[PDB]
């Protein structure tokens, strides 16, 4: 395996064991043990090899890591460098934060072909995560434009804590 | 070559071209007050020299 069951969640596998009581035998069965024998067996082999091969010479390499940097919040007014800082900072959250919804949107997918026709009933677990999710990327990062950038994300950040500062305050007393 | 590259590069350039942003828009306010005003180093204009005038005693006493 290559992905936890944290980060992707797999519903448990479990499949029935049917018992063939007809006279008549199952042909699918032959079809998986000559599948076995001339196609399964000599590309495991052949796997085999190349993988001894790869483990003869196996080269490391790591993971990039990023020094976290002062946002454009507390950037100063026109500082071009902390501004810079703070730019791609928030370039490569916003990045993170598409790879986080591109991952809840595979999760679910997943979820639906699993539960197959009871989709409806057995993914509003995972249907709920991705609809908070969604609901509140388009108030962290959509309606940006094409320009988009950290200034333009604090604004609109900033107009909705206003918003909902001054409903909180009138309806509330 | 790495990210750093990119990046110390883009530092460089941006904080030159933002020192010369703003001292353009310094030449542009000094150069609008040494014209309103004329109390600086340029934008003089000739006036006529002191040393031209004579000083000695005309025929005309109270000239």
Request: one cysteine or more; proline letters at 6%.
């Amino acid at each position: 395996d290559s992905w936890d069951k944290d980060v992707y969640p797999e519903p448990p596998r479990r499949t029935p064991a049917p018992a063939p009581q007809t006279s008549l035998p199952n042909p699918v069965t032959y079809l998986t043990k000559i599948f076995d024998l001339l196609v399964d067996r000599p590309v495991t082999l052949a796997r085999e090899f190349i993988e001894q091969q790869h483990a003869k010479n196996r080269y490391y390499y790591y993971h990039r890591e990023f020094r976290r940097v002062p946002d454009i919040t507390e950037c100063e007014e026109k500082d071009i460098l902390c501004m810079f800082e703070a730019e791609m900072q928030w370039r490569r959250d916003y990045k993170v934060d598409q790879e986080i919804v591109n991952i809840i949107q595979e999760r679910l997918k997943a979820c639906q072909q699993r539960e197959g026709e009871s989709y409806r009933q057995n993914c509003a677990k995972e249907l709920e995560q991705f609809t908070q999710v969604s609901k509140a990327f388009q108030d962290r990062y959509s309606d940006l434009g094409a320009h988009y950038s950290a200034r333009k994300c604090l604004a609109k950040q900033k107009q909705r804590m206003l918003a909902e500062r001054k409903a909180a305050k009138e309806a509330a007393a | 070559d790495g990210p750093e590259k990119n990046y110390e590069k883009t530092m460089a350039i941006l904080q030159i071209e933002a020192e010369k942003a703003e001292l353009r828009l310094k030449e542009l306010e000094v150069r609008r007050l040494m014209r309103a005003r004329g109390d600086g180093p340029w934008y003089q204009y000739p006036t006529i020299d002191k040393a031209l005038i004579d000083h000695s005693p005309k025929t005309t006493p109270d000239n």
